[PDB]
Design a binder for this molecule. Structure first.
Ligand code: HEM
Ligand code: HEM
Ligand code: HEM
Ligand code: HEM
Ligand SMILES: [Zn+2]
Ligand SMILES: [Zn+2]
Ligand SMILES: [Zn+2]
Ligand SMILES: [Zn+2]
Lengths: 106, 106, 106, 106
């Protein structure tokens, strides 16, 4: 999938997590986000098209995906443990990673 | 790319890191490993064809890529710091992750 | 050190990172934060004095320190790479961990 | 506790996990390992007594504790999920971290 599709998948499922009542819902949404974030890894954002594929900027771009992937990973464990509220809070917290990357690169 | 290509990329660059003489070579190889691992995320292994895409087995399979991706991430920081030997050591230690997944799923 | 002293160390160095001009200042402050957070691990917060040392609650409390330690770890790599701004951003972002734990346990 | 005691704690509980029959035994063991690892953070190893407390070598020493702590953290989540065998395998795998640090610093 393209960057925009992966971004909408990320966006859609974050809201699913907010409105969710149960672990399964959170679980499912986080799984989809993990796949979206991993697939986003190879993308070149439009503001970085003029940069070398292995530039410092591109390195920093992809680092944000590492952070987001790590966070989804942990939130998923929480939801697997049945810690719904705390997985939802981890989801709220990862928005900081979404925002930080958007502020620099979007 | 498919699973097999990602796996060759992973294997090829691990050997490149072993033979490397400077941090640029390690850095370049780890970057290629991270892309390969991230791209591998969505793959279904032949041994798990018969399992649901959202099965416990498939979750455990993808978990190994989380572990791999985290370790590459960290090793790349070490290489960026010019810590060639310790980045090469981190790379040798990664093999545990490679092996553990192969033993169960390959 | 006590929980309070570790908490002040954490507080003080966070501000040091905000005002910092170079990577060495940030590195030094994160190093101090890492030791404070690791030393905090064994503490029982006043709100949880009545809970068993290996209770659900106490596990969740210490989980927040795993999260914080992980974040400092990564931020320190960024500072080591000379990525001052992004290390400072990483430091602003880990405030979410600080606050999440306080909201629940302070 | 001192370095030796923390190392004994780490060693004893690793064996407990190997012999374990259920998730509770592995959970309990990993919990103790986490505390021992976090307490070990501040220690100076006999081989690095002559180095500055904020030396490059001391930084690399403590870095291995970060990686150990992260692995215990993850292994604990697996045990929490009731994935006993997988938690026991994550425990086997972190021996790589134990050994890597001993090779350089013990
Ligand atoms: C879970 C957190 C995230 C959420 C909820 C999210 C969601 C979104 C949304 C709704 C958009 C609007 C455009 C669209 O429809 O795709 C977008 C765009 C974008 N995001 Fe994110 N995103 C997240 C994480 C990230 C991260 C970590 C990065 C960078 C490493 C990033 C980089 C971008 C870029 C470059 C665009 C513009 C794409 C384009 O216009 O071609 N996002 N994202
Ligand atoms: C740096 C670590 C790794 C290395 C060097 C590595 C290396 C390889 C190599 C050389 C192959 C054979 C190439 C081929 O398939 O034609 C392979 C296959 C495979 N690997 Fe890995 N691998 C690594 C990590 C992983 C991880 C973490 C997993 C699972 C989480 C995994 C799962 C698999 C699977 C399922 C196959 C079979 C694909 C097929 O033959 O169709 N590998 N790997
Ligand atoms: C870098 C992030 C953090 C900062 C800057 C911070 C800061 C503080 C400060 C300034 C205090 C007041 C203590 C005093 O006045 O001496 C405090 C107390 C406290 N903090 Fe944190 N904290 C952080 C992270 C955490 C985390 C991760 C946890 C738990 C997982 C936590 C749990 C507590 C508790 C239980 C208290 C109350 C102890 C008391 O009664 O004094 N904090 N913190
Ligand atoms: C879970 C993995 C680990 C296990 C099972 C383990 C086990 C041990 C054992 C059995 C000893 C013998 C010392 C004694 O009993 O007096 C020891 C010592 C030591 N270990 Fe580890 N350890 C682990 C992790 C680590 C790590 C990650 C580091 C480095 C950061 C490390 C550094 C050392 C050092 C420096 C000593 C020497 C202690 C002294 O002589 O005062 N160990 N460890
Ligand atoms: Zn966790
Ligand atoms: Zn590291
Ligand atoms: Zn990083
Ligand atoms: Zn995990």
């Amino acid at each position: 999938a393209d960057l925009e599709d992966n971004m909408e998948t990320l966006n859609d499922n974050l809201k699913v997590i907010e409105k969710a009542d149960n672990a399964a819902q959170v679980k499912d949404a986080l799984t989809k986000m993990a796949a979206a974030a991993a697939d986003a890894w190879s993308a070149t954002p439009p503001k970085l098209e003029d940069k070398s594929p292995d530039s410092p900027e591109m390195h920093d771009f992809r680092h944000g995906f590492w952070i987001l992937i790590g966070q989804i990973h942990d939130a998923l464990h929480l939801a697997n443990e049945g810690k719904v509220k705390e997985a939802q809070a981890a989801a709220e917290q990862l928005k900081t990673t979404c925002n930080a990357c958007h502020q620099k690169y979007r």
